[PDB]
Write a protein that binds this ligand. Structure first.
Ligand SMILES: [Cl-]
Ligand SMILES: [Cl-]
Ligand SMILES: [Cl-]
Ligand SMILES: [Cl-]
Ligand SMILES: [Cl-]
Ligand SMILES: [Cl-]
Ligand SMILES: [K+]
Ligand SMILES: [K+]
Ligand SMILES: [K+]
Ligand SMILES: [K+]
Ligand SMILES: [K+]
Ligand SMILES: [K+]
Ligand SMILES: [K+]
Ligand SMILES: [K+]
Lengths: 292, 292, 292, 292
């Protein structure tokens, strides 16, 4: 089930930049306790960009193991070469992950036909459920509703993580896909609006440090208690924004460390330690949300 | 050396998507005869995106081999993880390439401080000249003149391929760097304007098929004969545009096939075959350039 | 009451470019019959830009007269000089119009403080209800939520026509204003989404030629029957878009003439007659909506 | 005549927002002494927006009177209704002005065909030289090079003030027009780059306060001495930017007051007094330019 508050979980690292298992276990336990619906392992927020495919796989398998059946795990499987997307997706075949989150090729800027071919080929080499992921500001590429429509016709392409923040997409996509195709926000600041328009949940950065509020907000939203959800949202909104005061996941990793959830806020270059001014910004926002 | 018309050469492939050595030979001879200044190997137009680092290195080594000292070769060495940039660069230590073209990290959207640390670390791990590469439309990331200025103080950071098409950047960068830092256009359509404002040459997609004209145009511009250079540019202008009618390098690979310069116009997914409408727009552009 | 489907009514002209009273009467009767909630007289769609203030006033007074108490009339009162906004607003004082629609100054690009001062001064010279109007693509100016908040504190500033198509504004504005402040869409293509997020109606261009469907859609929306409303919307959507195939109100005036609702589709320069290709586009869209 | 440094002169006002003749005299003498090429009267920087057409005409006539044949005067004649453009232009028939500066219609967003018909009709109703004026950020409308090309075929359409800051426009326009059509920058910050690409001068806000430097810089550029011109430009550059730290002409009116060139820095709403933060940014910029 790909609904509700789904965390794009940080990959906690030791001071050397390698996965820290104690901190991962702790984060996973926190999400199990907190009511988080599922975990996305090595998405954008999990530093897919700076992990090689072996390291990437190690983190996913380790996340799966530690989740220990208590919470479903979705593997990030994006690559800008179709052959590499297939090959990464194959690692997780018959593994216990429940689906894949797969981003539009970045940098090489395919046509809509190229995007169609890319995702169709990936979905054909797998039985795993596929969630498409559109994030033009990172990729240089925009997966348009008409093409989500085409791809939704492939049996195991089952959802989209829509990160544009362009709310008109929720109903442009909905009208082109079956009732069971799932529409997830990839933008925390607009994700409650997204759900109010008919979206089914959010793949959240905010949920890393505010898992309980996020899960409650998404459940309120799903029950149509939009006014009640919005009280939570307005408490989380400074966070929704300030977790991007510097490049994700620089802010949210610091926040995790500040909350005692991870041992170190280490990232891999080209991500750099949070600035002193970033700290104070994110600290303010944690306080506003009643977490500090 | 890093001046004039520098070709971002296509990586010619057989029907199976593998580097075609015989086609790479025709192309490399074509540039030796046409007065091209240097060859950028496995840049963007070279399908850096869809070559794994070992195929990437192959193509660079084969290019060096075939060029046989007749024309200098620059390796594309861009990666969005600093560690991977460094280890890619180290691949080409002692290789015979004259420098590296290294793009801002794509997808992960580092700060300017992160770009600084990225490029600094890369330059620290090599003796080869480094040409920075800014192309925000592909990367999600914009390397700003103030950061180019800091980086230009590093001994072997010697130039920038500036591909925004924002021509105010020429003299913003030029103000901040020494007289020997090279400013190269990475946008054919605005490259003559770029040179006329003080740029030193172009890393060119058009040069793939219009090598002699590109070489003459850039020499005229270097001499200050802008009116005469502009005459050539106006013939090339449709080509400058239509080589991007569908994602690069789809149109320019097709153009090379149509001229007999490569055996097939095959690309790797997510790049897809040229459309019929595209064929006709490109063929017209080539005729306008007097090339067919 | 400033809710439901509110038409931004064309100013029908004879072949000389002067208001045509027979066609105006006919349009007003059509809106009375059709269930249209209120009329906005000489807004953008009513060619405020090419009417002088005397002509502007004549059309408003004539519209009021013909409405004959059957349907409320809102006067467009925008001007980019505060003195002229006040002076136009004064014409309609004690006239029988029920409120004013007043746009952000265009061309001169005021600060948010300037916007505050502008609207506060206008509201102070009148007892009439004020609906602010934000349309950055026409004005060069963007009235932000925080400033709508400030102005909403002025007694007779009672609503906003929000034309950005940026749906995040609905709840950013809502959380800053009292429950009785009215949020109206100024963008037909996103207006049902706007209402689903908490908006109270739409100031519509589409409603000119599809008044009955629009009024029904808005009533469904207000009752929370969003799925039912959307069937209507999807029938109207080609219209929502193609009424801007050429600059408004060129398309919608042709459509009015095609439907027999006005005698001529004459506009004032710089608006030009619909192109033959525009005709066919708008005709297609009228057919899709079941109006032709 | 329509070359070099042309000043978009402020309209100096007393405390009551009325044209101050004594201040207009100081300014006009300042430009005669500083070698300014010509004076644009009641352009954008001249508060065209908030002057009614009769005050507008006054200020133009007073400017002509005070200039006393010592420096040529161009009238701003822009209006978004073609009829109003024509009747404004006819106001200045036989007046002594040397030409007109006429902006694309703002707010109503005409097609390119509409812009054509607009400017054609205006040029047909006068013998005075017409300088087109493109500034999309204010108007919502972009007059494209292909339409400039058509219009340049009209006898008395002799030039363009191009204010996009998009420098590719210089030679796109230049390709399409005769050698005697003038291309003028309407963007100070990029005006030297503009001239270096082939532009003939600048209609300048900076010239209000840096007249002698602006005149020298433009003469050097006209002579091809770009390095020497650039030295001046780099001193002026903070001023080029900070004169737009708050909406034009708020900062430049304040600068004029601070230099003693005008008695008050009063503006008309919706322009508001300069902030204290603005004061300090401008004062610093003026010191950097060596003007204080
Ligand atoms: Cl995005
Ligand atoms: Cl770019
Ligand atoms: Cl530019
Ligand atoms: Cl807008
Ligand atoms: Cl939106
Ligand atoms: Cl502009
Ligand atoms: K990676
Ligand atoms: K499916
Ligand atoms: K690659
Ligand atoms: K250097
Ligand atoms: K008007
Ligand atoms: K109020
Ligand atoms: K005016
Ligand atoms: K002419």
């Amino acid at each position: 089930m790909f609904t509700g508050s789904i965390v794009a979980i940080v990959t906690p690292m030791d001071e050397k930049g390698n996965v820290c298992r104690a901190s991962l276990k702790k984060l996973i336990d926190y999400h199990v306790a907190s009511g988080t619906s599922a975990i996305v392992s090595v998405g954008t927020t999990g530093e897919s960009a700076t992990l090689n495919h072996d390291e990437h796989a190690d983190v996913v398998m380790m996340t799966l193991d530690l989740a220990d059946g208590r919470i479903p795990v979705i593997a990030g499987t994006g690559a800008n070469a179709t052959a590499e997307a297939i090959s990464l997706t194959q690692r997780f075949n018959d593994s216990g992950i429940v689906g894949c989150l797969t981003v539009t090729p970045y940098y090489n800027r395919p046509s809509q036909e190229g995007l169609y071919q890319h995702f169709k080929a990936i979905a054909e080499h797998t039985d795993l459920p596929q969630i498409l992921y559109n994030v033009p500001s990172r990729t240089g590429c925009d997966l348009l509703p008409e093409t989500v429509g085409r791809l939704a016709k492939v049996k195991n392409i089952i959802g989209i993580k829509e990160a544009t923040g362009n709310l008109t997409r929720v109903n442009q996509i909905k009208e082109l896909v079956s009732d069971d195709f799932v529409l997830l926000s990839g933008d925390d600041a607009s994700a409650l609006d997204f759900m109010q328009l008919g979206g089914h949940g959010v793949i959240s950065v905010t949920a890393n440090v505010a898992a309980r509020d996020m899960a409650q907000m998404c459940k309120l939203a799903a029950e149509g208690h939009f006014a009640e959800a919005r009280v939570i949202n307005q408490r989380l909104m400074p966070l929704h924004n300030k977790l991007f005061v510097e490049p994700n996941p620089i802010p949210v990793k610091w926040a995790c460390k500040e909350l005692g959830l991870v041992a170190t806020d280490t990232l891999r270059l080209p991500m750099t330690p949070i600035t002193d001014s970033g700290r104070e910004t994110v600290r303010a926002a944690l306080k506003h949300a009643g977490l500090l």
